[PDB]
Paper text:
The frontline antitubercular drug isoniazid (INH) targets the mycobacterial enoyl-ACP reductase, InhA. Inhibition of InhA by INH–NAD results in impaired synthesis of mycolic acids. Here, we report the identification of the diazaborines as a new class of direct InhA inhibitors.
Compound screening against purified M. tuberculosis InhA identified three initial hits, AN2918 (6-aryloxy-benzoxaborole), AN3438 (5-aryloxy-benzoxaborole), and AN6534 (7-aryloxy-N-sulfonyldiazaborine), which had inhibitory concentration (IC50) values against the enzyme of 44, 12, and 79 μM, respectively. To validate InhA as the target of this series, we isolated six M. tuberculosis strains with resistance against AN3438; the frequency of resistance for AN3438 was 6.5 × 10−7.
Numbering used by the authors: 2 to 269
The structure:
């Protein structure tokens, strides 16, 4: 039976059925986890999407930029899972960068307000979610966030790369706080995944140069990866998250696990 059996896990970041978060939730549920889901803004759409998951699960609202949503999140979760119960797991699968700081726009022409909003949502929110939810987490529990390796610069990704560099630093401090509760904190640095958003870029929505750049990155990724890399398949990364959520990596924290086919270990 299941890898996450009898675990209570909060999963953020579902927006479509091609969301990495969607697959994380699916696999987790397939593995016996009992879930609490969170969503931003488009709650009617999200509710419809999440009905396509294997099992029923409460959907709660969370705009990570809303100080009231965060302050109330713990109480609202406890209500959904029942009093006298706590969370074993939390999944941060949230990211955003205005098109001004990421894509076709030059690196220098991103105005700070846009940059700041992206860091807020993509990095700081990892800390604020942890603050909100640690008091209602069990020992042995696990917090997991989604990363994209920012240790080297690349075209297009631009300020989102900077946000991921920030998020990695954030995760190391959150581990310090999380350790006090017997709770681990880690990032999964995933390889490129064809989300709906990504698929549109590949199809030319951000121009032919941008479409060409993403296509070079993907082809080179699969080449470099010793076991290959399938941009269309989010399942291997979801399993990696489930692994970190499980009891089978109990000594790992403040750390980054790479679900990228080994590509980052190879120059070419």
């Amino acid at each position: 039976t299941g890898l996450l059996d009898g675990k209570r896990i909060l999963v953020s970041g579902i927006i479509t059925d091609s969301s990495i978060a969607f697959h994380i939730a699916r696999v987790a549920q397939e593995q016996g986890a009992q879930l609490v889901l969170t969503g931003f803004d488009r709650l009617r759409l999200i509710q419809r999407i999440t009905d396509r998951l294997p099992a029923k699960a409460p959907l709660l609202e969370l705009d990570v930029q809303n100080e009231e949503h965060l302050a109330s999140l713990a109480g609202r979760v406890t209500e959904a899972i029942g009093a006298g119960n706590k969370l074993d797991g939390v999944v941060h699968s949230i990211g955003f960068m205005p098109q001004t700081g990421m894509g076709i726009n030059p690196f220098f022409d991103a105005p700070y307000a846009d940059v700041s909003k992206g860091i807020h949502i993509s990095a700081y929110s990892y800390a604020s979610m942890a603050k909100a939810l640690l008091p209602i987490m069990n020992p042995g529990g696990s917090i997991v966030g989604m990363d994209f390796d920012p240790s080297r610069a690349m075209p297009a990704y631009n300020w989102m790369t900077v946000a991921k560099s920030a998020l990695e630093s954030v995760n190391r401090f959150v581990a310090r706080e999380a350790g006090k509760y017997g709770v681990r904190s880690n990032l999964v640095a995933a390889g490129p995944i064809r989300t709906l958003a990504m698929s549109a870029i590949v199809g030319g929505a951000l121009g032919e140069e941008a479409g060409a750049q993403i296509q070079l990155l993907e082809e080179g990724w699969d080449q470099r990866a010793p076991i290959g890399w399938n941009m269309k398949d989010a399942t291997p990364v979801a399993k990696t998250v489930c692994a970190l959520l499980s009891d089978w990596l109990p000594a790992t924290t403040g750390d980054i696990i790479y679900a990228d086919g080994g590509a980052h270990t190879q120059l070419l």
